[PDB]
Amino acid sequence: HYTLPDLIANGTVAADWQFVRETANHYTNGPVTDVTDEAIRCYELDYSATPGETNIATVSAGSTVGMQGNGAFYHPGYFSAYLSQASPAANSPDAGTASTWFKIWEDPPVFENGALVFPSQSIDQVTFTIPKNLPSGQYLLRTEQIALHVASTFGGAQFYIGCAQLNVVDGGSGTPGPTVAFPGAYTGNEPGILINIYDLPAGYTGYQSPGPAVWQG
Numbered sequence: 001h002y003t004l005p006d007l008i009a010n011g012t013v014a015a016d017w018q019f020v021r022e023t024a025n026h027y028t029n030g031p032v033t034d035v036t037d038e039a040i041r042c043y044e045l046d047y048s049a050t051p052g053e054t055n056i057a058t059v060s061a062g063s064t065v066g067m068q069g070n071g072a073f074y075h076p077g078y079f080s081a082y083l084s085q086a087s088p089a090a091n092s093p094d095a096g097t098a099s100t101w102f103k104i105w106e107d108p109p110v111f112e113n114g115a116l117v118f119p120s121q122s123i124d125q126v127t128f129t130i131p132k133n134l135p136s137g138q139y140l141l142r143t144e145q146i147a148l149h150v151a152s153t154f155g156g157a158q159f160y161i162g163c164a165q166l167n168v169v170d171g172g173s174g175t176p177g178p179t180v181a182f183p184g185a186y187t188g189n190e191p192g193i194l195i196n197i198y199d200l201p202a203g204y205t206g207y208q209s210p211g212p213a214v215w216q217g
């Protein structure tokens with residue numbers, strides 16, 4: 001149970017919801033649990049108001065950004081970050097409503113010694129790279145942890161989500177893809193989401209990250 005309110009950019013941490021759309025769990029810190037629900041995208045407190053209540057952070061392609069939670073990410077889970085071009089601007093509720101989301105980063109559990117080994121449950125932040133070859137322009141950045149401690153039943157996986165509003169400058173000329181939509185990218189049946197992390201099936205090959213392949217340039 002945690003929010004992701006602080007964008008990390010230029011080597012510094014922004015204020016709560018300065019660049020991140022305030023999410024509906026701002027008090028409860030509870031997760032999104034329905035991947036068919038519009039909340040799976042940016043978890044906004046109010047779809048029509050919250051984007052306009054959010055500033056837009058200017059960052060350069062190739063620079064390191066990230067997200068800090070309001071506490072340590074103590075559930076075991078899978079982390080990801082998606083970008084979408086944001087038209088007319090990152091502070092619009094129209095931004096990212098289409099299938100323009102592409103994955104740029106993930107931090108999955110790894111299957112070693114017959115058990116899943118998860119990223120640290122004592123960190124309260126994640127960082128990753130805006131692709132150097134990313135075209136300059138405005139983007140939504142969606143960062144999530146899919147917490148898997150009770151994910152053995154359908155809808156048991158827990159999504160903790162924050163969307164930052166970006167102005168990317170000094171970019172490249174790449175063509176990002178594959179693109180997906182939120183909602184749309186997840187069904188809830190993925191072997192990385194509908195998963196018993198404690199009793200893995202006998203022929204378990206390894207953790208399969210959900211969603212599309214990463215684009216890094």
Ligand SMILES: *[C@@H]1O[C@H](CO)[C@@H](O)[C@H](O)[C@H]1NC(C)=O
Nearest residue numbers: 009010014056057058059060
């Ligand atoms: C990061 O630094 C660049 C260059 O100094 C600046 O243009 C940009 O506005 C900064 N972004 C922030 C502080 O979010």
Ligand SMILES: [Cu+2]
Nearest residue numbers: 001002030075
């Ligand atoms: Cu929790």
